[PDB]
C-alpha cells in the first residue's frame, strides 16, 4: 500500500479489546488533591537528545487553564514548581475542608469541569470561594451547570441550554524549550486560547442551532461517549508557525494527534488489550462546504478512518514520532498518486469496514452505516521487533518469468544511478615472502652465458611502469627489505665445505654494508641489524664490528658510490646502490658499473672473504664478465629471488675471495631464471589491467562497484517503473549478493543498492536477449532499516577457502579446454552454476544433477540446457548427442553418494558414455598420483579402506589404484591419447579472482597445489594412438618406450614446467641424464628408452613430420624416491662434545636439516650445535634443555620444506642420565626458571637480579637455540629445571 507519499500496511493490526470507565466521588476529589508521593498525576516530558524535563502532559483533572499566563506565576526549575504546587495544594485541602469536612460524607459525584473552574481560579490566584455549593452533583450537571444565567463569564459562558467554554489544558511547555529536532509539540494545547467546544447534553437541538453557527472554523467531533458528553467543537484563527516548514491551523494539528494516537493502536494486537475506547478520534462534523476532497485534512480524515480499521505504516514506528519525523510524513503523503483505499466518506454517514477487527461499530449507530457488500480485505501480521543497523546487507534474487526491453532499462536507470563518485578504492593485495634460492650444485651439467633470454625491451615505458609502481602501492606488506635482509643471511647460514664439514661463517668478524638506507625516521640502515644485535632474529650469532654507509648517511663523512673510494678490508661484505644513470642504453654503461661494483668488492674484502650483492640486469655480459673474473676465485655461490612483489630482482653470493674454484652455470639454475621470467612476465601483463586509486567511478570499466537509489519504491501492484530500474541493475549486475541501505533523508524515504560490475557479469550481459524481471514481494517484504553508507572498492579484506581455490583453478582449467563450437556435458553441475556465463556463447550446452535447479532462462542468445536426474543414469545417452566430457565435483561427490568403491562407479560411468558421441573426456580424478603425502587441516587419510577425508568439506570419498584405471581406459578404447592434467605452477586464474575482486596470497594457493597434486583432472582423447609403455618412470631407474611406425622424418619435444626440456633432434641442449630416442628402420617403429633423474609430469609434444606439424601427445608422471628413513641410534649416553655419533639411513636422494620448535616457529638450533655429514652420519651436540624441548629432523634441500618426512626427535629428547660428572647448563627458554638438585634447589635462571654462582663455570661461548642463552659447566648432581 503505496498512497501518495506514504508506504504502509497490506495487513491489518487492530484490536477489539476495551475497558470500563471511572466514576468520581468525594475521596476521588480528595485523593486527586493530595497528589501522591510517587502517584503523581503527571507527566514530565523531555527533550530526546539529553532527555532534560521540559515540557509536562496533564491528567484530568488537574486541568481548568484559560487565562494568560502572566497570570500564572512558577519558577523555571522543576522541583521548584512542584514544591510551590505542593504548597498551594494543601492550602486549598484545608480550605476545601472548611467547607465541607472530611467526615461531612465519603464519596459523592461532582462536576469534574466545576472542579477545573476552581483549578484554574485558584492558580489565577482570583476569588471563587462563592460557586462552592455548586460541587456537588445532586443528579445531572447539566441541568446544574444550566441553572445559572451571569457569573463568571471567563471560565464558562452559557448560551440557552447550552455551556460554552474550551476544555480544561493538557499540555504545557518549560522554560528550557529549544525546537530541537529532539522536541516533540504539544500541537498548542497549551495556549491560553486555542480551542472551544460548547454542550448541552444532546445532538439534535443544537444540529437546529448550528445554522445559526460558524463551520468555517471547523466543525469536529469525537463520537465515542466521553462523560464530558454530548459536545461539538469550534477551532479558532490560530496556526503554528513550528514545525518548519509548516504552518499549522490547529484543527488539522489536534487531527494529527488523534491520528497518532490510531496509530499507537494499531501497534499491538491481543485478545486483551485493555483500552476503555479504541476510538477518541474526530470526523467532521461541520465544514464540508468550504474545501474539496483533495486537501490535506480529507487525506487525514482517510487516513483516519484507515487506520481506525487497523492499518498501519510500513517503517518501523517510534513511541514518539519526532517533530522532523512528522514533517517529512507530510513531505511524502502530500505527494501525488492515489488513495489504496477507496472509500469517500460522508457527513450524510461513516462507513462500517468490512471486518475489521474492533468492536465500536458493535456499540454505536450515530453517524455509522456499514456496507454489508464489503469484502476488500487482508490477512494479518504484525511485528514482534523494529530496529536500524548500518551495513550494507546482502540481499539475493530470485527471479520470474516475463521479459522486457534493454534500451529501455538503460533509460530507466539513467534516473536512479549513484554514478558518478569517486569509491574507497580500500586494499588490493597482501605481501607475501615467497623465495627462490638456488646454489651450487655438482649433478648438473654446464652452462654457457649463451642461454638465458634478457629482459624484455618493454621494461622502460611509463604506463607498465606506473602500473608495476600502482601494484606496489596495492599490496599489504612492511619494509620488505627487513626481511629481505633476515632471510638472505638465514640462508647465508648453511654453506658447508666438500672437505672440512664447517660452514664459513664465523661469529665477531668483520662485517660491511653499503647501500644503505637513507632514513625515514632516524635509521640510515637497515633495521634487521637492531635485533641481529639486540638478539631477536633466530640463532643468527652477533658481529664485533658493523661499517655502515651509503649514498647519504649519518654515519661516518660520505662519498658516493658510483666511483672508486678508499675502504677496508672486512670479514663480509653487504653491497647494494642506489640507481643513477641506468637506461637501455646506459647499459654498457651500467656493466662497466657492476664491473667496478665487483672490483671494488674484490679489493676491498679479506683473503678468503666472501660477500653479497643485488643484481637486476639480465644482460649477458654480467655473468659474462663475472665468469671472466671470479668464479674461479671464489669457493661457491648461491643466489636467490626474495619474492615479495613484482620486479625483476636478482641477488647473489658469493664464498672464499681468494679461493679458487672454477665455477660455472648449471640448467636447472637457468630454468629457476627463465621461470622468473615467464611467471613476473605474466603478473606485471595480469597487473596492466585495474582502476586508478580512489578515481571517481563514473562507469568506464568492465569491473568496479555499481549502486542506485530509490524514493517509496512502489510496492503496490505498480512497481513498472521501480522494476525496470532494478532488473536492469540486477541484470548488469547479475550473479552476486548485494548490499542493501534502507533509510530516510530530506524527508524522504530510500533505499540503496550496492553491487559490482566484472567481466564475468559482461559475459551475462553478452548473452541475452531480453530482460530478466524480478519480484520486489520480498522486496516490500521486510520491514527492515539501514544507515547510509560510502563507495568501497573491496567487500572482503582477508581471508580464503582453498575450496573456492581449486575450484577457479578447475574453472580456468576447464575454460583453459573450453574452445571452438562445442556442445559439452557437465556432470555434478549446480542448480547455481555460474561456470555458464565463464564458458563462450557460440555452442550449446548441457548441466547434469541430482539436486533441482535455481535458474532463470528463457531470453538468452544462447540455449543453455539443465537436467534434475541422477548423473549416474542412462537410456537417454542415446537420446542425447555431444563430443566432450566435463565432470567436476561429482566423481568423489557421487561416490560418496553411492558409498562404492572407485572403480565400480567409474566403469559404471564408462557404460554411460558407452552410447553416444564423445571427442574428448574429462573427469575431475581422485588419483593417487604419489605416496599419500598429508596436509593439515583438511585431509585426513585412510590406508585401511583407500579414502580421502576432507574435515574443512566434512565428508570421505574413496579413492583406488592407477594401473586398473589406464587399463580400463584402454579397455574402453584402446585407441586414445591420454592426458595426466597438471597445473601447480602458474597462478593466472587467480587473476579472474581479483577479476572477481578476490584478495589472497599463497598459503592457500599453494594448500589446493598439494591438493590437486594428487586431485588432478585426466583429459583423454578416443581419436588417439596408444603410447605403449614398458618402464618405470622412477628417477634413476630407467623407462623403455616403444613406438609403432612414424618414419624417421619426424622431431619430438619433451617438456617439463610448461618449459621445452629437449627434444629428438639435439643432444648438445639434451637434457635426460641418458636418452635413446632411436628409429628401428626394420620394423620402422621408435622406440625410446633412457634414465632419468628426475621425477614429475613432463610430457610429448610430436613434431609429426619434417616441416614440423606440432601435434599434442599425452602427458605422463614420475616418481621421486621414497619417504622413508631410519636413524641408526645408539643407545650409549656420554655428555662428550664429542657427543653421540648417531648414524642414518636416508634414501640416496636426499638431505636434511632440523629445527626447534619455538612455540609454534620452525626455528633452526645453532648451527654448531650439531653436525651433519653423509648412510648419513651426524654429531648434534646436547645440554639439559633439551629434554625440554620438542625436536624434529627435516627434509631440507629445497624451498617447499617438509615435503617427504618430517621425524620426531624423542630418542634424544628422552633420555637417562649420570651423576658422576659435570654438564652444560643451557636453557631451554628465557622463562622464569629455577634449578633444583634432588628435592634441594639450586637456582633461579632467568629470574630479576640473578648472579653467577662460582659453583658453575660460565662458558664464554654457549651451547643454545638462539647464541644467547647461558650455558656453563656444573659440578655433578641431580639438578633439574622448573619454571615459575
Known sequence: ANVWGVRLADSLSSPTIETRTRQYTLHDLCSDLDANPGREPWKPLRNQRTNNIVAVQLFRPLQGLVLDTQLYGFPGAFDDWERFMREKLRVLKYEVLRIYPISNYSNEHVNVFVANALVGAFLSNQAFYDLLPLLIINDTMIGDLLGTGASLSQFFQSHGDVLEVAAGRKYLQMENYSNDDDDPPLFAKDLSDYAKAFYSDTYEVLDRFFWTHDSSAGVLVHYDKPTNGHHYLLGTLTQMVSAPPYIINATDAMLLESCLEQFSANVRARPAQPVTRLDQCYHLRWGAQYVGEDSLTYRLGVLSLLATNGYQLARPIPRQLTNRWLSSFVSQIMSDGVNETPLWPQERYVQIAYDSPSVVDGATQYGYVRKNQLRLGMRISALQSLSDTPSPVQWLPQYTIDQAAMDEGDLMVSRLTQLPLRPDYGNIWVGDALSYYVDYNRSHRVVLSSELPQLPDTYFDGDEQYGRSLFSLARKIGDRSLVKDTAVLKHAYQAIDPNTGKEYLRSR??????????????????????????????????????????????????????????????????????????????????????????????????????????????????????????????????????????????????????????????????????????????????????????????????????????????????????????????????????????????????????????????????????????????????????????????????????????????????????????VVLDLGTGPEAKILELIPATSPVTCVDIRPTAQPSGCWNVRTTFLELDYLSDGWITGVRGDIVTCMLSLGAAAAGKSMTFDAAFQQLIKVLSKSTANVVLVQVNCPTDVVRSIKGYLEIDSTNKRYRFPKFGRDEPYSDMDALEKICRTAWPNCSITWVPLSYDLRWTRLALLESTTLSSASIRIAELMYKYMPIMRIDIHGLPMEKRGNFIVGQNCSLVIPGFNAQDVFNCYFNSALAFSTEDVNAAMIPQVSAQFDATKGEWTLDMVFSDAGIYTMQALVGSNANPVSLGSFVVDSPDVDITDAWPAQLDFTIAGTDVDITVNPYYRLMTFVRIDGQWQIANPDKFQFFSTLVMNVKLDIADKYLLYYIRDVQSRDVGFYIQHPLQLLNTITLPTNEDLFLSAPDMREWAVKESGNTICILNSQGFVLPQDWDVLTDTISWSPSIPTYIVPPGDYTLTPL
Not at 592 to 603: I, N
Not at 747 to 763: E, Q, W, Y
Not at 799 to 817: I, Q, R
Request: hydrophobic share 40%.
Open 509 to 822: 668478524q668483520s662485517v660491511a654494508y653499503f647501500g644503505a638506507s637513507a632514513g625515514h625516521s632516524g635509521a640510515d640502515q637497515p633495521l634487521v641489524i637492531e635485533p641481529w644485535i639486540q638478539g631477536k632474529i633466530s640463532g643468527v650469532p652477533p658481529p664485533s664490528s658493523v661499517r655502515q654507509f651509503g649514498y647519504d648517511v649519518a654515519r661516518g663523512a660520505i662519498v658516493d658510490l658510483a666511483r672508486p673510494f678508499p675502504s677496508g678490508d672486512y670479514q663480509f661484505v653487504y653491497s647494494d646502490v642506489d640507481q643513477v644513470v641506468d637506461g637501455h642504453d646506459d647499459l654498457s654503461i651500467s656493466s662497466g658499473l657492476v664491473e667496478s661494483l665487483l672490483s671494488s668488492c674484490m679489493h676491498a674484502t679479506a683473503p678468503g672473504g666472501s660477500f653479497v650483492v643485488k643484481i637486476n640486469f639480465p644482460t649477458r655480459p654480467v655473468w659474462h664478465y663475472i665468469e671472466q673474473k671470479i668464479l674461479p676465485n671464489i669457493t661457491s655461490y648461491m643466489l636467490i629471488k626474495p619474492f615479495v612483489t613484482n620486479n625483476v630482482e636478482l641477488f647473489f653470493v658469493a664464498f672464499g675471495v681468494h679461493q679458487h674454484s672454477s665455477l660455472t652455470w648449471t640448467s636447472g639454475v637457468y630454468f629457476f631464471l627463465v621461470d622468473h621470467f615467464y611467471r613476473y612476465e605474466t603478473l606485471s601483463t595480469i597487473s596492466r589491467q585495474l582502476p586508478s586509486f580512489g578515481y571517481v567511478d563514473d562507469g568506464s570499466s568492465v569491473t568496479g562497484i555499481e549502486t542506485i537509489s530509490i524514493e517509496n519504491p512502489g510496492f503496490s501492484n505498480m512497481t513498472q517503473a521501480a522494476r525496470i530500474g532494478i532488473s536492469g541493475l540486477c541484470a548488469n549486475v547479475g550473479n552476486a549478493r548485494k548490499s542493501i541501505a534502507i533509510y530516510e533523508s530530506h524527508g524522504a524515504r530510500v533505499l540503496t543498492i550496492t553491487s559490482r560490475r566484472s567481466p564475468a557479469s559482461a559475459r551475462r550481459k553478452s548473452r541475452l536477449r531480453y530482460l530478466p524481471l524480478i519480484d520486489p514481494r520480498s522486496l516490500e517484504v521486510q520491514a527492515r532499516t539501514i544507515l547510509p553508507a560510502d563507495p568501497v572498492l573491496f567487500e572482503n579484506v582477508s581471508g580464503a577457502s582453498p575450496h573456492v581455490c581449486l575450484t577457479m583453478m578447475y574453472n580456468f582449467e576447464v575454460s583453459s579446454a573450453v574452445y571452438d563450437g562445442d
